[PDB]
Design a binder for this molecule. Structure first.
Ligand SMILES: [Ca+2]
Ligand code: NA
Length: 259
C-alpha cells in the first residue's frame, strides 16, 4: 500500500553497542530474503574506524537482540561509512576511500560486481550534515535498489539513481534541489526521497520530499526523534514497512504511516 509518509513513530531500541567501535554503524534485514537467509536474518556492522571489515550475521531476531552472531563475514576490503544495504542475498557497500560500490554475495562470501558511481563525490565531498564520509547512501524500496549521492555537476544537491542489483548499472537518475550536506540523512519510500533535518535534536523533522514519479519537490514537518542525539544511519525497509536507524551506539527502529 504505497502512499506519502504522514507519520513516524517513537524510536524503539532493539540492541545497544557496548564499545566505541559501534558509536555509529548500519544494521539491516533483507527485504527479499534468499536462501539460506529468512526475513528474520539481521546483519550488523560497527563502522567506527578505518579498517571496517567484520559483518555480524544473526539467524534469528532473538539473537540480534540478545547474544552473539551466528556467523561473522570478513569483507575482502574495508567498508566506508554507514550507507550499506542488504538486498537479494547480497551486501552492497562502498569501498573505503573510493566511489566504488561492491556487491558481496553473503552465502558464498564472493564479490560478484563492482561499479564506480559516475561522478559521485566521496570521502567528504558531499556527506550528510554530520560528516562521517557519508557521501554515498544505498537504498532499497518497493521497486528495488537505489544509490543516493551527489556530483560536482549537481553542486552538492542530492542525486538519486536506480541500480541494477545484478551488475550495478545505473538505470535512471534524478536530481533534487536539496543540498546533501544540509540534511542529516535520507531514505526512499515508494520512489519518493525523504530527508531528515537534524541528527542531534530530539525534535527533528522529516523536512523535504522529492517524488521521482512526478518530479514534485516538497516541504514537510513530520516529527522525528533522535532519542540518543547522534543518528549516523537512517534507512527504510520496504518489507517491514519501518525505518532502521543507528543512533549513538543504539540500533533503533521507527514505525511509519503512509497515506
Ligand atoms: Ca539512508
Ligand atoms: Na543506506
Amino acid at each position: 500500500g504505497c502512499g506519502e509518509l504522514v507519520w513516524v513513530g517513537e524510536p524503539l531500541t532493539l540492541r545497544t553497542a557496548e564499545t566505541i567501535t559501534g558509536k555509529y554503524g548500519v544494521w539491516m534485514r533483507d527485504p527479499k530474503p534468499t536462501y539460506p537467509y529468512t526475513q528474520e536474518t539481521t546483519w550488523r556492522i560497527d563502522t567506527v574506524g578505518t579498517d571496517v571489515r567484520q559483518v555480524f550475521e544473526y539467524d534469528l531476531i532473538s539473537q540480534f537482540m540478545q547474544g552473539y552472531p551466528s556467523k561473522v563475514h570478513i569483507l575482502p576490503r574495508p567498508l566506508e561509512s554507514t550507507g550499506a544495504v542488504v538486498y537479494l542475498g547480497s551486501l552492497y557497500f562502498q569501498g573505503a576511500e573510493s566511489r566504488t560500490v561492491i556487491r558481496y554475495e553473503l552465502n558464498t562470501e564472493t564479490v560478484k560486481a563492482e561499479k564506480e558511481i559516475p561522478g559521485a563525490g566521496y570521502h567528504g565531498q558531499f556527506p550528510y550534515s554530520w560528516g562521517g564520509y557519508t557521501d554515498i547512501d544505498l537504498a532499497v524500496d518497493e521497486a528495488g535498489l537505489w544509490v543516493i549521492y551527489s556530483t560536482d555537476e549537481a553542486k552538492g544537491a542530492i542525486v538519486l539513481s536506480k541500480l541494477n542489483p545484478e551488475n550495478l548499472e545505473l538505470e535512471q537518475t534524478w536530481e533534487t534541489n536539496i543540498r546533501k550536506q544540509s540534511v542529516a540523512n535520507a531514505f526512499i519510500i515508494c520512489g519518493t526521497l525523504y530527508t531528515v533535518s537534524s541528527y542531534t535534536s530530539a525534535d527533528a523533522t522529516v523536512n523535504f520530499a522529492y517524488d521521482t514519479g512526478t518530479g514534485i519537490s516538497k516541504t514537510l514537518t513530520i516529527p522525528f526523534k533522535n532519542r540518543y542525539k547522534y543518528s549516523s544511519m537512517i534507512d527504510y525497509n520496504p518489507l517491514e514497512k519501518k525505518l532502521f536507524a543507528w543512533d549513538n551506539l543504539n540500533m533503533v527502529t521507527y514505525d511509519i504511516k503512509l497515506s
